[PDB]
Amino acid sequence: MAECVSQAIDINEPIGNLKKLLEPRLQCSLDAHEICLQDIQLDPDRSLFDQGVKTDGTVQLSVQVISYQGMEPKLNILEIVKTAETVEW
């Protein structure tokens, strides 16, 4: 459906590290599923500072594993909150 996981990462650093950091959390081999945000596909090679928010440090990502009826597996962040005091767009 929309298998969500809550985990945090560096925003000035690569967002694609979700394949590494959510490995323990999802117990899933992070491979075919590309990283995304609210369904917008992102660049693992680029950061939140490259994609979306220009805030600071580590945000908490409510990122989901999306494979919609055989659609292209995406890990979308539905929620970015810098540290805990939610950053906003």
Amino acid letter, residue 74: K
Decide: 75 and 36 in contact? Cβ < 8 Å.
yes
- CATH number belonging to domain 1-89: 3.10.20.90
Look at the block and give the residue holding tokens 């890990």: 75
Report how far residue 75's alpha carbon sits from residue 28's, in angstroms, rounded to the nearest whole number: 12
Do strands 74-82 and 34-37 pair parallel, antiparallel, or not at all (unpaired)? Answer: parallel
Query: Does residue 62 come out as left (phi exceeding 0), alpha (psi in the -120 to 50 range) or beta?
Result: beta
Q: Which of these, 24, 15, 14, 27, lies nearest to 61 by C-alpha position?
A: 15
